[PDB]
Design a protein around this ligand. Sequence first.
Ligand SMILES: [Pt+2]
Ligand SMILES: [Pt+2]
Length: 124
Amino acid sequence: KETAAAKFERQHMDSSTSAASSSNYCNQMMKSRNLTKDRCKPVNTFVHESLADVQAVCSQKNVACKNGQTNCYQSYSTMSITDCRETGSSKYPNCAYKTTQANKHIIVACEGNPYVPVHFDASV
Ligand SMILES: [Pt+2]
Ligand SMILES: [Pt+2]
């Protein structure tokens, strides 16, 4: 089975580029990462940074997670993310997404050894 670490990389890591190429980015990436397969995943953030820079967040500012757990970390620096958000008119199997590009702090949940992102909590 896929590790929580490996699932975080499939869902949230796009080291290819450094930002959204067009506004078809989400429609292609949500597809290529198997996020439109069972259902249309409604909201998903891709981080356009190196694995090393996103994993280092786990040594940065310790914060509460949305669920009340305290294994969350806020990045000290802003990071290049694409927010992917299903349109109101999107219907499975033809999933449609709005692509928003931004530079923001990420909050991730970390666990295991090595201590690495397992959950994308939010961008701030
Ligand atoms: Pt800031
Ligand atoms: Pt988890």
